[PDB]
Amino acid sequence: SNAMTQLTREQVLELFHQRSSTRYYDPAKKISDEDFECILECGRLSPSSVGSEPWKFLVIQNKTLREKMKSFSWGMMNQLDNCSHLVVILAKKNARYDSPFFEDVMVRKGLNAEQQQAALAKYKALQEEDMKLLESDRTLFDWCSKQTYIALANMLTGAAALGIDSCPIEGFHYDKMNECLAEEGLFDPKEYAVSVAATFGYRSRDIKKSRKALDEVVRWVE
Amino acid sequence: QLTREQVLELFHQRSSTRYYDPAKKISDEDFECILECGRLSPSSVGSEPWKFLVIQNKTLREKMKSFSWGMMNQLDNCSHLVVILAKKNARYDSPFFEDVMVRKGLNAEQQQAALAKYKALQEEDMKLLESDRTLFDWCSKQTYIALANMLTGAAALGIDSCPIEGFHYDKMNECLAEEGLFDPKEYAVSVAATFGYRSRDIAKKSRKALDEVVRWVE
Numbered sequence: 001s002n003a004m005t006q007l008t009r010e011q012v013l014e015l016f017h018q019r020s021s022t023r024y025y026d027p028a029k030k031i032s033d034e035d036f037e038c039i040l041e042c043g044r045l046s047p048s049s050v051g052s053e054p055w056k057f058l059v060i061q062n063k064t065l066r067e068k069m070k071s072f073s074w075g076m077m078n079q080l081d082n083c084s085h086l087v088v089i090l091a092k093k094n095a096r097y098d099s100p101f102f103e104d105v106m107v108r109k110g111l112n113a114e115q116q117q118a119a120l121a122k123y124k125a126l127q128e129e130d131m132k133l134l135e136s137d138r139t140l141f142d143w144c145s146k147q148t149y150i151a152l153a154n155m156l157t158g159a160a161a162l163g164i165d166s167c168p169i170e171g172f173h174y175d176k177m178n179e180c181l182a183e184e185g186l187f188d189p190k191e192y193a194v195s196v197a198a199t200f201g202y203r204s205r206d207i208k209k210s211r212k213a214l215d216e217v218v219r220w221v222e
Numbered sequence: 223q224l225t226r227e228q229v230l231e232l233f234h235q236r237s238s239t240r241y242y243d244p245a246k247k248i249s250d251e252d253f254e255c256i257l258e259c260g261r262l263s264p265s266s267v268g269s270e271p272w273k274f275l276v277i278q279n280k281t282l283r284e285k286m287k288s289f290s291w292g293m294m295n296q297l298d299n300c301s302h303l304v305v306i307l308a309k310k311n312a313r314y315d316s317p318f319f320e321d322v323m324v325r326k327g328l329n330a331e332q333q334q335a336a337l338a339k340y341k342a343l344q345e346e347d348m349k350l351l352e353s354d355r356t357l358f359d360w361c362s363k364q365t366y367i368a369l370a371n372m373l374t375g376a377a378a379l380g381i382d383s384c385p386i387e388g389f390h391y392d393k394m395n396e397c398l399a400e401e402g403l404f405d406p407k408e409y410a411v412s413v414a415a416t417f418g419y420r421s422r423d424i425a426k427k428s429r430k431a432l433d434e435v436v437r438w439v440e
């Protein structure tokens with residue numbers, strides 16, 4: 001890393017202040033294919049526990065599907081008509097250490113058989129004892145869903161770095177959204193479920209930050 | 223504003239560092255900038271349901287080793303360690319949520335309408351109220367946004383990091399509560415992260431191809 005591959009502290013703070021939730025999009029302004037691919041890359045390159053990458057990104061451009069969405073998506077009703085791109089992020093269901101899904105996770109690490117068994121033993125303990133994820137199907141799904149929020153965050157920040165506005169979205173009926181997207185054939189509902197969404201585009205109305213102070217959220221243990 | 227190549231370089235510079243140089247410390251100003259990236263993160267309903275515990279005490283780090291397999295050696299060598307807490311019991315009808323509404327400036331009528339909207343969000347749209355753990359996990363998801371932004375902001379400053387789940391969560395929560403750092407009825411440990419400077423080159427790890435993870439619905 002050097003001064004040319006870094007941002008200054010001033011530039012980092014500007015980036016994270018600029019990143020904001022846009023609720024009014026200009027329908028006449030579309031993100032270029034290349035800029036949007038870059039945004040998706042920010043999601044794809046995100047870290048994830050155990051390298052599990054337990055996400056799928058559905059890019060919902062079809063206008064008829066966006067319209068149907070409106071009736072059960074109160075949190076983005078006024079964005080569905082005018083945003084450039086909409087991403088619905090799915091998270092993997094039943095991502096147990098002993099599942100076929102986890103074999104592919106391991107294969108792309110390029111480990112030998114002994115390293116693979118050492119890794120698997122770590123991941124079993126992580127799920128079973130340390131994080132207690134096998135309490136229920138939902139607990140294990142929510143673990144994958146947490147990893148998807150990393151990908152979400154990175155797509156919002158990457159978009160902001162490109163000068164592109166965005167809004168993270170939880171304001172929809174999850175059962176209705178899962179049912180609709182599965183009925184459209186967009187994923188196997190036994191294997192994935194909706195985690196979170198995000199809109200992207202260019203704002204048509206102005207957005208300053210309101211946050212708790214650093215001293216109210218940070219505690220130093222020296 | 224950055225070029226596409228610069229944005230890509232940032233996310234490629236960001237890697238999970240397991241081997242830290244124990245002689246390299248992050249400056250106070252750089253670390254405050256990292257914390258700002260967490261503080262400035264978005265969160266559902268603007269709930270900001272997090273606390274960032276900066277664990278620099280060496281005796282406390284040494285105690286954690288016995289139940290933190292995923293960062294055992296990082297604890298000896300990293301510059302800074304953050305344990306992020308998430309709010310427990312963040313119900314729409316809790317005082318925690320009332321404070322959110324008030325500081326947004328909502329009047330009495332608007333607060334009543336907002337309570338109804340977020341009741342519906344939690345009870346029906348997201349079904350967060352199935353159990354205490356489902357509601358906690360909602361706040362925990364928001365903290366993963368703050369985590370991600372800290373890792374990326376650190377990388378932008380030239381500072382290495384590693385997100386951490388590899389510890390016994392209940393033992394960590396018991397320890398940190400015994401230290402008096404939070405009220406365990408109000409918060410619980412969500413995720414951690416180390417920060418510092420790598421002691422060797424970190425081979426870039428693989429990812430599934432874009433075509434594997436993206437589906438276009440046109």
Ligand SMILES: Cc1cc2nc3c(=O)[nH]c(=O)nc-3n(C[C@H](O)[C@H](O)[C@H](O)COP(=O)(O)O)c2cc1C
Binds near residue numbers: 240293385413428
């Ligand atoms: C939430 C989360 C928890 C993780 N926990 C650990 C951990 O405890 N110890 C560890 O060495 N790596 C941990 N990792 C790092 C992942 O193994 C790593 O992100 C993945 O292998 C991809 O490598 P990269 O981030 O270098 O691209 C974790 C990652 C995330 C996102």
Ligand SMILES: Cc1cc2nc3c(=O)[nH]c(=O)nc-3n(C[C@H](O)[C@H](O)[C@H](O)COP(=O)(O)O)c2cc1C
Binds near residue numbers: 076172
């Ligand atoms: C996971 C998540 C879901 C959210 N859901 C919605 C939503 O459905 N609709 C909306 O208008 N804003 C939504 N927001 C945006 C938040 O209200 C916003 O992040 C917060 O008020 C802080 O504002 P800022 O992002 O402009 O800094 C969501 C944020 C997060 C992180």
Ligand SMILES: O=[N+]([O-])c1ccc(O)cc1
Binds near residue numbers: 387
């Ligand atoms: O050792 N561990 O508990 C780990 C190691 C890697 C990881 O991504 C998560 C947990």
Ligand SMILES: O=[N+]([O-])c1ccc(O)cc1
Binds near residue numbers: 074266
């Ligand atoms: O309309 N909604 O459901 C919302 C709106 C804003 C938000 O942060 C979360 C949910």
